[PDB]
Amino acid sequence: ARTTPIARYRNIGISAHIDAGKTTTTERILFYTGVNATMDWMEQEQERGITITSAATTAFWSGMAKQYEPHRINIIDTPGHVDFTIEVERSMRVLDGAVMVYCAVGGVQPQSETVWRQANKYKVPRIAFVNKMDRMGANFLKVVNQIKTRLGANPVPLQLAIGAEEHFTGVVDLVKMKAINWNDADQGVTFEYEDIPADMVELANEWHQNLIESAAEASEELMEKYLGGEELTEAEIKGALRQRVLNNEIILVTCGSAFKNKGVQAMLDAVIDYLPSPVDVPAINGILDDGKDTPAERHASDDEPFSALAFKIATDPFVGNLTFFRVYSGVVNSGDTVLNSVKAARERFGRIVQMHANKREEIKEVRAGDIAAAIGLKDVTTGDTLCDPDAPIILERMEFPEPVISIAVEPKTKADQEKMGLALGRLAKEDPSFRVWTDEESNQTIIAGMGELHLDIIVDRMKREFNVEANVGKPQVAYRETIRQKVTDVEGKHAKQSGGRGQYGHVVIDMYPLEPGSNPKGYEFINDIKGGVIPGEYIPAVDKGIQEQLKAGPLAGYPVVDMGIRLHFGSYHDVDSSELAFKLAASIAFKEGFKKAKPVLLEPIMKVEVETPEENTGDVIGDLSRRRGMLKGQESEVTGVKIHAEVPLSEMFGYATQLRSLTKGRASYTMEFLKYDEAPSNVAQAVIE
Amino acid sequence: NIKSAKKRAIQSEKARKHNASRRSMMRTFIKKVYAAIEAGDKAAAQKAFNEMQPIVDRQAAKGLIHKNKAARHKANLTAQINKLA
Amino acid sequence: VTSYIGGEGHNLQEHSVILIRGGRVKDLPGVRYHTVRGALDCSGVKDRKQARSKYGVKRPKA
Amino acid sequence: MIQEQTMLNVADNSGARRVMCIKVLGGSHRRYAGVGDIIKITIKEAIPRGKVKKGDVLKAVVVRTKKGVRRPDGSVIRFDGNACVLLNNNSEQPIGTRIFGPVTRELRSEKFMKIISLAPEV
RNA sequence: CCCGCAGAAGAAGCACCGGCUAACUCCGUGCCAGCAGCCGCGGUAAUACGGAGGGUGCAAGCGUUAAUCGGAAUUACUGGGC
RNA sequence: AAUUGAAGAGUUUGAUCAUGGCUCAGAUUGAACGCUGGCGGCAGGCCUAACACAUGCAAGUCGAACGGUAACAGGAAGAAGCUUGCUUCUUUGCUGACGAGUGGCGGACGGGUGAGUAAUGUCUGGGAAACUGCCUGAUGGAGGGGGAUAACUACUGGAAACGGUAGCUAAUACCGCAUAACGUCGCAAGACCAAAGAGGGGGACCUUCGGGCCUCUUGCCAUCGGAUGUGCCCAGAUGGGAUUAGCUAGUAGGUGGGGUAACGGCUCACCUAGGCGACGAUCCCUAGCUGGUCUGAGAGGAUGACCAGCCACACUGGAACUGAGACACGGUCCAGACUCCUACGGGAGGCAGCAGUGGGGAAUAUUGCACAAUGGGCGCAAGCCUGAUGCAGCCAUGCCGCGUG
Ligand SMILES: Nc1nc2c(ncn2[C@@H]2O[C@H](COP(=O)(O)OP(=O)(O)CP(=O)(O)O)[C@@H](O)[C@H]2O)c(=O)[nH]1
Ligand SMILES: [Mg+2]
Ligand SMILES: [Mg+2]
Ligand SMILES: [Mg+2]
Ligand SMILES: [Mg+2]
Ligand SMILES: [Mg+2]
Ligand SMILES: [Mg+2]
Ligand SMILES: [Mg+2]
Ligand SMILES: [Mg+2]
Ligand SMILES: [Mg+2]
Ligand SMILES: [Mg+2]
Ligand SMILES: [Mg+2]
Ligand SMILES: [Mg+2]
Ligand SMILES: [Mg+2]
Ligand SMILES: [Mg+2]
Ligand SMILES: [Mg+2]
């Protein structure tokens, strides 16, 4: 129909290291915005007391001083942790601003590093909030300095703390140069906007004067007057730094103590002050359908053709499938029939809901620059584009973190087996960073996720939401078998003088080993037969014969690999010999030859590439060695150090978990199959079926 | 249940209570007549019979007994009050 | 019950979800059903062109 | 007073019906359980539908004992029967979702709160 | 529903082609890979497998499966037998 | 004129004839799946879990029955910031109207479902012992009194759902009394039974100047008819099984009390010793029936979605009350299973109404629009209510046109 505010939209996401307060502070907002509802409402996430899934609400900030024309803010509180990073890839692709939280005590810390990289990956503007200023060991400026050093970024303290830890009373707006006083009860609200105290005047008389100079560096004519010692107006500084915040060249820092209520509020102001509108933002990239590029563009316009991206999929018990989206362009009304471009199927919008702090309010229309959940949409997975069917476009689609941990699961009670297939399937489409498949060999169900905890609460989600408990183990291994010695002329024979068809077979051969040559074969059959000792028509079966035993060798089943066999001698009856008769002799020929060929158990090795900080390339190297692993290089890739190693599969299980422990959480790795090598004796004799 | 035609329930309760005491009384007079019949006291029977007739007859009109019951009662009681009394 | 998997090549393994069609095989006694290619986890036949409706193979982009 | 052996009536749905005590938890040589202590259980009865089944082994809170309970001043509450509520072996916490018969204010623990919210008395 | 306006423009698939059964060839493959309602095709010139060209049949549907009756006078009263 | 319409083929053998199974060509579908997909018209759309259900809606309506004012309007037992006949505060139920309350009618219709029911039902055909709101034809009544009560008011309890004491009030609420036949009982003589008022307008005459009074429209009581609806009785027909052959104590009949609107072991006491069954009782298994639908030349077989008739059921088991009608889908009570709210003392609820979710499944739709038409509830009416209904949304599911030249 009409709509109301528009362009005064603030799409921000809060994210940070664990604890930090990146959810306490989110609830605090809701209180202040909501003058006149915990974001950890998952059962599992209340028991454990940690954000597991990103929680979205919207609320209206009138500005703490009454100062502002009321703005509509779309907030998204996200996980700290890792394991569920996907909940930040998405929770950062889509929205416009970002409030990076930091613990007054715990500095940057490893998972601050990760969410930072993710902000850059999507070039999202940002400010900063140093929480917990009331805690033992608090040091505002230290963290400020760390943002610069540890994240190699450009911080600009937009503020200053009034004391620290148990003596933390308020803050200094070092723009309007006053020491905001939050009071006793009413938690926040009020002010008395008090002036700087005598204590901090000298420090306060900085601003980081390279604030006004970092405001200066906005535009030269904005500093030309600064050069002439012309004190710039309060209004043109806010515009200046914002200009540069909006250009990711600078990060304003704010600080506070959500627990003590002395701070959250100034930060909200700082959101509208310096964080983007949906229009102060690059229009979207993308493609056309079959055709080619052109960025879809789609300017942030109510009067453009509708286009939105689907992030995050859920299922509420009472209203069904929820499908969250960010409308970049155009508009959808309740009943419009939009297009899923990346599936080439159309969907019909029906009900629409905005999670509204503490009430699922219903809506009939959804404009650009807003987010919401569409009820009932049939086949919409995460990353899909929902555009106008007449003006069709694929959008960029964030990235899918790709799992680091794998595990075999069996359904405890044989009945549940069916139910597992279902539930693992459901949890899969919800969470693209989780994966499930069935081992093409050794048919066991295998799940894989971004970590120990990740898998934990997946499994935990099976029990809770599908009443499927299943226990867990280390995956089985696909071993192989071969021989070591080239064995000379071994004799396989048949002779069936019984009661009907004669059936006689005689074959003499050499079973010699091979090297990992020719991709398809791994098996070489030579017809070095004499003049015609065996007719060329019974020569296809002896080959076929041998083919049969290669499927599960005599050591412990398992495929037989890298084998060569030569024909030399044989014999037949002018009739009694046969298709079968030599095929069996070959079978007998394979045995005995195999017994006498010194058989050995092969195991699969991986080409392993670890990417790690320079600080502990020793520990990692060492662990690789400890895992019976072979090393082959180190590159020294820019900032980390790519470490190359060949290490056996049956030993890399749960690698991710310890690599994490060894490297403070900063260390990718990757693997794929490389070859089959001899298993150490202790291994071999153990692998016994 | 949350439909104001629940006042219907509260009304019909008043109704039962009304019908309760009247139909109680009516019966206790029909009781009295048989008391004579059983006692043998031929006079007391007509005394009460003629005492209950107005009750029973009225109650048929009031519609808490409806016609032929009132008919039947005094009908066969007549047929008994003078079978020795 | 046991069911045929017609067509050249297939996926299908231990925990696949499939769709049974009914239809016997005069060569496999006790096999009295077909698997319906291209429904649920059962992929269609690779590169098949004639009779793709069976074997669940979509029209090769004309 | 419950002790090993001893049949309890079960005071929830869950399907248990008649349940025997196979241990009294809470100490070496602890003799009796009562009041609202916890005990290890074996299912002797069980319903056809049932959450739990015959031969299952769980825990349970004694909620009603025929020897009863004191409270200060000196009073005494006795119940005719012996009753418990089946608890999951790992997290305590009622496995049922309804309570039957009275319970006593002693059960006013953090972890037994769910019990007294259900339950139609004391 | 009527009248204006632009421009062939926005709009063709599915099954089948050894006999019953309307419609035939080459090529690949070689009792393999596979087909199959029924009989039966495949072990080197395959009109039967897979592709192609060609053809027949239906057509915004076409196939397949599931299902009832028919064909079945094969529960026979009509209308069968030992 | 009008149910006037019957096709065979493949396959046993070296070959043949016969027998006989299997198989195919036809039609049909509340379908599904695979590949493909332009429109429209009319129609169809949970066949499985009668499985559980968030949320909204599906039953109201009369101030022309009554006391009434909280809100909304105008008018004000009439007034300001002054903006002197345009206002927005404060008062007045005056009038329109109307929250809550008493009362009345409806909620027993409409709509859903197929669980139960092999005959407590259904179909065809008969029958005698019954009641029947609203609508109706006819005859007369409509006199005079009486005791109460919600609301309300003063205290007072709860987290809530709900209320608790005390006091007052209206009526078409309620109860006597009078009246009392073509009514009930009775052979008769005789006994005995009811009810209510409310509105619109108005000459005089009269007035506590409220009205009386006149008139007109409605409503109330009674009885006999009518109409429609329902209850009850009998006969024949309405699946499979005998690897179910015996069944039966209120059982079968009689008498007399009681009972119901009514006939009746419907009930109770006593007395007879019966009653049913191979023309299938009993007991098991399955099932809602019919009009009809599909197939078939017919006879048959198959079937009971959509439309209409009939029955049954309303979370499960059971029960009555109110009432013309229920043993009540959106009523009450009790028990159960389950779920939900709680400030832990206690409370609440039943989508097989419409839409919608979860679940099951190969599989079946939108949390749309409007009472404008038709029709139902109340109302004098205007009107209000109406998820019946009329339309629209979704799906090639079908039938029929048409196109894609
Ligand atoms: N002492 C103190 N504690 C604080 C402050 N702010 C937050 N906390 C505490 O940090 C703890 C965790 O807060 P939380 O909001 O859950 O952080 P989080 O970002 O959601 C952790 P996750 O990464 O799982 O989402 C809480 O106990 C909270 O009280 C503070 O200002 N002072
Ligand atoms: Mg499903
Ligand atoms: Mg009655
Ligand atoms: Mg031909
Ligand atoms: Mg060839
Ligand atoms: Mg071919
Ligand atoms: Mg026939
Ligand atoms: Mg015969
Ligand atoms: Mg009213
Ligand atoms: Mg049934
Ligand atoms: Mg009288
Ligand atoms: Mg009698
Ligand atoms: Mg009698
Ligand atoms: Mg026949
Ligand atoms: Mg019932
Ligand atoms: Mg209901």
**Straight-line distance between termini of chain C:** 39 Å
| Percentage of residues in helical conformation of chain A | 10-25%
The CA-CA distance between the termini of chain A, in Å, is 71 Å
Ions, cofactors and other bound molecules? phosphomethylphosphonic acid guanylate ester, magnesium ion
Total beta-strand segments of chain C: 0
- Rounded radius of gyration of chain A (Å): 34 Å
Global morphology of chain A: elongated
Residues in β-strands, percent of chain C: under 5%
Structure description:
The structure is cut from a larger assembly and holds chains A (689 residues), B (85 residues), C (62 residues) and D (122 residues). Chain A is built from 17 helices and 32 strands. Chain A has 689 residues and is an alpha+beta fold. Chain A is elongated. Chain A starts with 8 loop residues before the first strand and ends with a helix. Chain B has helices spanning 7-39, 42-62, 68-81. With 62 residues, chain C is largely without helices or strands. Chain C has no helices and no strands. The termini of chain C are far apart. The interface between A and C is small, with 6 and 5 residues. Chain B binds 2 RNA strands through helix 1, helix 2 and helix 3. The PDB classes it as ribosome/antibiotic. Keywords: Protein biosynthesis, ribosome, RNA, EF-G, elongation, factor, GTP, gdpcp, viomycin, tRNA, tranlocation, exit, peptidyl, 50S.
Protein topology:
The structure is cut from a larger assembly and holds chains A (689 residues), B (85 residues), C (62 residues) and D (122 residues).
Chain A: E1 9-15, H1 24-33, H2 43-47, E2 55-61, E3 71-77, H3 86-93, E4 97-103, H4 110-121, E5 127-131, H5 140-150, E6 155-157, E7 159-164, E8 167-173, H6 201-204, H7 212-216, H8 220-227, H9 234-245, E9 251-253, H10 264-274, E10 307-316, E11 320-329, E12 332-333, E13 339-340, E14 345-346, E15 352-355, E16 360-363, E17 365-366, E18 370-375, E19 385-387, E20 405-410, H11 417-430, E21 435-438, E22 445-449, H12 452-466, E23 471-473, E24 480-483, E25 487-493, E26 506-513, E27 523-526, H13 539-549, E28 563-571, H14 579-593, E29 599-613, H15 617-626, E30 630-633, E31 640-648, H16 655-662, E32 668-678, H17 681-686
Helix pairs in contact in A: 11-12, 13-14
Chain C: no helix or strand
Chain D: E1 5-10, E2 18-24, E3 38-43, E4 57-64, E5 83-88, E6 92-94, H1 113-117
Parallel strand pairs in D: 1-5
Antiparallel strand pairs in D: 1-2, 2-3, 3-4, 4-5, 5-6
Bound molecules: phosphomethylphosphonic acid guanylate ester and magnesium ion (15 copies).
Chain B binds two RNA strands through residues 1-9, 11-16, 18-19, 49-50, 53-54, 56-63, 66-80.
